[PDB]
Write an enzyme that holds these catalytic residues in place. Structure first.
Site, PDB file in Angstrom:
ATOM      1  N   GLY A  13     117.729  46.427   9.884  1.00 30.17           N
ATOM      2  CA  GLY A  13     118.350  45.214  10.388  1.00 30.17           C
ATOM      3  C   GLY A  13     119.849  45.328  10.603  1.00 30.17           C
ATOM      4  O   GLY A  13     120.372  46.354  11.059  1.00 30.17           O
ATOM      5  N   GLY A  15     122.329  45.635   8.630  1.00 30.98           N
ATOM      6  CA  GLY A  15     123.034  46.673   7.898  1.00 30.98           C
ATOM      7  C   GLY A  15     122.872  48.043   8.525  1.00 30.98           C
ATOM      8  O   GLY A  15     123.812  48.848   8.538  1.00 30.98           O
ATOM      9  N   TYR A 175     116.443  30.967  -1.654  1.00 33.49           N
ATOM     10  CA  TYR A 175     117.173  31.807  -0.711  1.00 33.49           C
ATOM     11  C   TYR A 175     118.482  31.145  -0.287  1.00 33.49           C
ATOM     12  O   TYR A 175     119.544  31.777  -0.306  1.00 33.49           O
ATOM     13  CB  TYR A 175     116.318  32.109   0.520  1.00 33.49           C
TER      14      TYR A 175
HETATM   15  N1  NAP Z   1     118.232  37.696  10.018  1.00 34.89           N
HETATM   16  C1  NAP Z   1     119.158  36.629  10.366  1.00 34.89           C
HETATM   17  O1  NAP Z   1     118.983  35.993  11.351  1.00 34.89           O
HETATM   18  C2  NAP Z   1     120.344  36.332   9.440  1.00 34.89           C
HETATM   19  C3  NAP Z   1     121.088  35.216   9.638  1.00 34.89           C
HETATM   20  C4  NAP Z   1     122.136  34.950   8.815  1.00 34.89           C
HETATM   21  C5  NAP Z   1     122.441  35.819   7.782  1.00 34.89           C
HETATM   22  N2  NAP Z   1     121.697  36.929   7.572  1.00 34.89           N
HETATM   23  C6  NAP Z   1     122.082  37.793   6.466  1.00 34.89           C
HETATM   24  O2  NAP Z   1     122.338  39.313   6.973  1.00 34.89           O
HETATM   25  C7  NAP Z   1     122.087  40.149   5.978  1.00 34.89           C
HETATM   26  C8  NAP Z   1     121.010  41.214   6.398  1.00 34.89           C
HETATM   27  O3  NAP Z   1     119.886  40.503   6.873  1.00 34.89           O
HETATM   28  P1  NAP Z   1     118.693  41.168   7.846  1.00 34.89           P
HETATM   29  O4  NAP Z   1     118.307  40.095   8.838  1.00 34.89           O
HETATM   30  O5  NAP Z   1     119.166  42.392   8.594  1.00 34.89           O
HETATM   31  O6  NAP Z   1     117.368  41.443   6.878  1.00 34.89           O
HETATM   32  P2  NAP Z   1     116.505  42.856   6.668  1.00 34.89           P
HETATM   33  O7  NAP Z   1     116.230  43.523   7.993  1.00 34.89           O
HETATM   34  O8  NAP Z   1     115.216  42.540   5.932  1.00 34.89           O
HETATM   35  O9  NAP Z   1     117.407  43.902   5.760  1.00 34.89           O
HETATM   36  C9  NAP Z   1     117.653  43.551   4.425  1.00 34.89           C
HETATM   37  C10 NAP Z   1     118.172  44.820   3.705  1.00 34.89           C
HETATM   38  O10 NAP Z   1     118.469  44.385   2.490  1.00 34.89           O
HETATM   39  C11 NAP Z   1     117.752  45.423   1.502  1.00 34.89           C
HETATM   40  N3  NAP Z   1     117.236  44.940   0.250  1.00 34.89           N
HETATM   41  C12 NAP Z   1     116.345  44.017  -0.135  1.00 34.89           C
HETATM   42  N4  NAP Z   1     116.279  44.069  -1.470  1.00 34.89           N
HETATM   43  C13 NAP Z   1     117.104  45.023  -1.897  1.00 34.89           C
HETATM   44  C14 NAP Z   1     117.409  45.463  -3.155  1.00 34.89           C
HETATM   45  N5  NAP Z   1     116.842  44.979  -4.398  1.00 34.89           N
HETATM   46  N6  NAP Z   1     118.272  46.451  -3.321  1.00 34.89           N
HETATM   47  C15 NAP Z   1     118.876  47.016  -2.249  1.00 34.89           C
HETATM   48  N7  NAP Z   1     118.580  46.575  -1.007  1.00 34.89           N
HETATM   49  C16 NAP Z   1     117.695  45.575  -0.833  1.00 34.89           C
HETATM   50  C17 NAP Z   1     116.677  45.802   2.180  1.00 34.89           C
HETATM   51  O11 NAP Z   1     116.080  47.097   1.732  1.00 34.89           O
HETATM   52  P3  NAP Z   1     114.589  47.596   2.282  1.00 34.89           P
HETATM   53  O12 NAP Z   1     114.760  48.226   3.650  1.00 34.89           O
HETATM   54  O13 NAP Z   1     114.117  48.618   1.292  1.00 34.89           O
HETATM   55  O14 NAP Z   1     113.595  46.470   2.389  1.00 34.89           O
HETATM   56  C18 NAP Z   1     117.092  45.921   3.650  1.00 34.89           C
HETATM   57  O15 NAP Z   1     117.638  47.123   3.969  1.00 34.89           O
HETATM   58  C19 NAP Z   1     121.585  39.249   4.829  1.00 34.89           C
HETATM   59  O16 NAP Z   1     122.597  39.051   3.929  1.00 34.89           O
HETATM   60  C20 NAP Z   1     121.183  37.913   5.518  1.00 34.89           C
HETATM   61  O17 NAP Z   1     121.265  36.799   4.524  1.00 34.89           O
HETATM   62  C21 NAP Z   1     120.654  37.202   8.398  1.00 34.89           C
END
Ligand code: NAP
Length: 271
Positions: A13, A15, A175
């Site tokens: 995602g 990151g 969350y």
């Molecule tokens: N998606 C949106 O539209 C959106 C909107 C606003 C804010 N955000 C924020 O952006 C950031 C990233 O979100 P994303 O959408 O890219 O979600 P994502 O694709 O699911 O990626 C989440 C990452 O966080 C890691 N993670 C989960 N548990 C972990 C743990 N115990 N230790 C270490 N890493 C862990 C995951 O590792 P794994 O690969 O092993 O699962 C994954 O690499 C978050 O802070 C989110 O709140 C997202």
């Protein structure tokens, strides 16, 4: 010598695409991930040059693992320029809570408490680093959900407690609560440390990344906040063309941000 940035949750995602974007800009990225094999597969998959990244193990749901990641990072003898707290977990379907190895509800444990310990340790590294433009960037949320008087934390946040305000478990609200904790941590970091250290402490909402803006664009926005001079302003929440977003009453509550900090230190073993 390439500036060094740590990105949590770099294997997927936002990151992962932030890793790509900063590697392209000439940075060396520490991919702090819980699944080392998924992370190496993801970096190769996006064709990131191996000179530009190092994968180290980090599981935010285990406070021992956080300390182990910090040990591994410090062993590289690389001065730190920036930290991006990006990792998050969301469990939309749970009806009963799941607890971390340390006894804490997993959404708050991962998204807030593990980051909170990581920040407190790596603040030492940012302070000691000789880089001139150092930044700690926290991924936030749109909601600018309620922590009450933090009764759940005041009581130690162990099972059967499962919400920060001590009320019954709701997974979606857990969350949002955890992202509000992120926002309050960014605000207390700025209040307590910006003048003292010169580190820029801010947060950002990159947009709605289904999987609307693309994962690639969201990662580029993270890179701008980390690296570009136009974003060198501490204590602000960036949103998108980017603007400074005024925060909610609860996120602007300075007494609450300080009390969340004090209680979090206790829960992660820093008191
Ligand atoms: N998606 C949106 O539209 C959106 C909107 C606003 C804010 N955000 C924020 O952006 C950031 C990233 O979100 P994303 O959408 O890219 O979600 P994502 O694709 O699911 O990626 C989440 C990452 O966080 C890691 N993670 C989960 N548990 C972990 C743990 N115990 N230790 C270490 N890493 C862990 C995951 O590792 P794994 O690969 O092993 O699962 C994954 O690499 C978050 O802070 C989110 O709140 C997202």
């Amino acid at each position: 010598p390439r500036p060094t940035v740590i990105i949590t949750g770099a294997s997927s995602g936002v990151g992962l695409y932030a890793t790509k974007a900063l590697a392209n800009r000439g940075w060396h990225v520490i991919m702090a991930c819980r699944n080392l094999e998924k992370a190496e597969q993801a970096a190769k998959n996006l064709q990131i040059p191996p000179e530009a990244y190092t994968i180290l193990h980090l599981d935010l749901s285990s406070l021992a693992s956080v300390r182990g990641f910090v040990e591994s990072f410090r062993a590289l003898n690389r001065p730190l320029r920036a930290l991006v707290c990006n990792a998050a977990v969301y469990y939309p379907l749970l009806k009963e809570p799941i607890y971390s190895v340390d006894g804490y509800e997993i959404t708050v444990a991962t998204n807030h408490l593990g980051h909170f310990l990581l920040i407190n340790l790596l603040l030492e590294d940012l302070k000691n680093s000789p880089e001139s433009d150092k930044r700690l960037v926290i991924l936030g949320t749109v909601t600018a959900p309620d922590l009450g008087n933090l009764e759940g934390f005041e009581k130690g946040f162990k099972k059967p407690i499962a919400m920060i305000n001590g009320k019954p478990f709701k997974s979606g609200k857990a969350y949002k609560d955890s992202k509000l904790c992120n926002m309050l941590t960014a605000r207390e970091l700025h209040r307590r440390f910006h003048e003292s250290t010169g580190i820029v402490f801010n947060s950002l909402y990159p947009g709605c990344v289904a999987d609307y803006v693309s994962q690639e664009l969201a990662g580029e926005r993270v890179a701008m906040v980390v690296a570009d001079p136009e974003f060198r302003q501490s204590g602000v929440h960036w949103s998108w063309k980017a603007f400074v977003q005024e925060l909610s009453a609860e996120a602007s509550d300075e007494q609450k941000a300080r009390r969340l900090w004090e209680l979090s230190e206790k829960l992660v073993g820093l008191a």
